[PDB]
Symmetry: C3
Subunit: 273 residues, 3 copies
């Protein structure tokens, strides 16, 4: 009932967003948006959720985030030696030592996290970026210059390697965000975007650039598909030849698939060799 009331305020405001402005926003509404941001930040709200074995999206959460961008004023952020200027608060500002201990997260300087992103215990953030609305479950490693984009869902024990990006999905509203399920390895410099889902136990090698337009070639079956890496897939960068053989175009290739039992026994290097 309480969340149904909060959702209602958000949806009615979003409906007439085209006649709202920073100078004209209900004080009760700016409070409501901040209530949703707080729930996203502490994990009690999450933008997408696996329900009855299906990933589902909560559009009203995206609407609250979209409304924060429209209605919140930019303010100076004073770093001493320089200034920034933005409207989205950072996650770790008034955080005490106890609170950091209780969180179980390591935030390596100078990793940057916006408020409205949840990050579970035993996660390590190397210098990296986590955007508003993201949900990072337990035991995740976010390596240097990686990016966890808006609303992205990162599962337990996922390894996002150096310079790898998980693309944000705030619009369209009905789109599932980019989802990396439990125990996935994302290799360095890869980029998984636009609501692609990488299912459980997958291994993505280096330089895999995977969006909704990227052909996925399954070399075992010979099928070409889009938008989903099935569970336990080993994925490498490849090419597909032209019809006349004059050239080839970039694609992702599924070179093997591995059950959970095997995934715990064989190393990533052996899987790619």
């Amino acid at each position: 009932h309480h969340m149904n009331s909060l959702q209602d305020l958000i949806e009615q405001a979003f409906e007439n967003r085209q006649n709202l402005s920073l100078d004209t926003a209900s004080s009760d509404l700016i409070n409501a948006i901040n209530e949703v941001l707080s729930g996203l930040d502490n994990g009690q709200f999450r933008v997408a959720e696996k329900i009855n074995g299906e990933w589902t999206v909560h559009q009203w959460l995206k609407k609250a985030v979209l409304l924060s961008f429209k209605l919140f004023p930019n303010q100076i952020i004073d770093a001493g030696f320089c200034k920034f200027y933005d409207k989205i608060p950072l996650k770790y500002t008034d955080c005490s030592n106890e609170q950091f201990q209780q969180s179980g997260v390591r935030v390596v300087p100078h990793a940057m996290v916006r408020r409205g992103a949840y990050i579970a215990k035993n996660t390590v953030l190397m210098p990296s970026y986590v955007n508003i609305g993201a949900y990072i479950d337990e035991g995740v490693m976010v390596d240097t210059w990686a990016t966890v984009g808006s609303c992205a869902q990162i599962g337990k024990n996922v390894h996002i390697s150096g310079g790898a990006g998980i693309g944000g999905v705030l619009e369209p509203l009905q789109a599932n965000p980019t989802i990396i399920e439990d125990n996935c390895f994302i290799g360095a410099r890869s980029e998984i975007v636009e609501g692609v889902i990488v299912e459980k136990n997958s291994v993505i090698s280096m330089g895999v650039f995977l969006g909704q337009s990227t052909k996925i070639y399954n070399r075992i079956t010979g099928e070409v598909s889009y938008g989903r890496i099935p569970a336990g897939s080993v994925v490498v960068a490849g090419n597909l030849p032209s019809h006349d053989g004059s050239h080839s175009l970039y694609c992702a290739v599924i070179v093997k698939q591995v059950d959970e039992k095997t995934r715990a026994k064989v190393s990533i290097n052996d899987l790619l060799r």
Copy 2:
């Protein structure tokens, strides 16, 4: 006349740069260099300019920037929790809230911009880097861990996606900088360097690494070229086969070309599909 006098000081100093030093620089010259840096920073000077339909370069502006690197001393930059040490001032230091409002730029923490780069209103800098001499026109999105290199010219409404880089061109003096014209999309992890020009309305997909040595294959015509993406081109990563078929080498492929009318109607995803 006033700018012709300023240019003269810069050129005469640059001529005898090999006998200048940090301890021996005219006080009037360090002022002149700073006058050019100020004009670059507020957009009244720009390193390259489209004149009579041709992009042209102002070598004397590069010479001023080169002289700043030679003559300016490094100084401590105190970030409180650590120190840096460099000779190029940052753009946003003594900036007031009013000045940030007047600029119309959002500088998301912790985006870093050197002084001597111009950034026009309605631009959003995610955590990213903009180097000295760059010119970023109105409405540009610089996404997370993107880079706008020295002297780069970024047109209106350009989208530089996450982890994409626009390479700097300070030397050679006569070289046009890397130029991205109006309404271009630069896909994630791409890198456009070494004075390549991407003309108006082009769409560059992910993982396109494009420099002066990169073959550009036009699959419509079959031509191979270098250094220029014609207006309205859709560009993806590809390969070109060996003469004996033993291997292939990386290249960029122009897979379609689109007029301005079509460019506003069809989405980027549909263009790449």
Copy 3:
């Protein structure tokens, strides 16, 4: 004798690491670990070393670093506008202006370096990351969003281009770290990881993703190899065709090899053309 005593303390502690903890660490041991960290930071210890023409690794140095991660407590790092939370000190904190001058390093804001990494004079760090245990020799350029990973050995006059990463190797203990020898060029967005060695005078082009599982095709000889770029190699991204020709998979291609005499005369662009 003094270093043999220090090594002994480290090795005996590492042996019974599984029964050590942050709350139970010898005060004399936390001092010993800090002595090794200091020696790594000032270059008097280095994790790997070329001895009698062979690169060798000092496992006990890695053990000290591993013990710092286990035993050092996380602490708040106060950046004023936000906080971080980590257990590894930064290299440049109490550094004076004189010390920065004496170091000969430029640390461009906001490049981040952990303590326990050595960086020699005439090196320039653009905003980038250098991890604990790395050794960066004289005259190196680390460009924007590059990464020098843990224990990596970077030779004199190496150029790590924008967005390029040198992968860390802390485990396995016996593995040589990723090694880039003198006068190598590492092109933008490339990633050299997992203890690959790039020998002297090599030129690596853009988008080269090179780990222990990456096939290296030598187009002059036709040989496929792993883990080593021989001295003077020019390396570009390529593909290798499927046995049935349905697809190809990513690889690195050695397209030329160049002696030291030629390497100083011919430009990188001419080498790749």
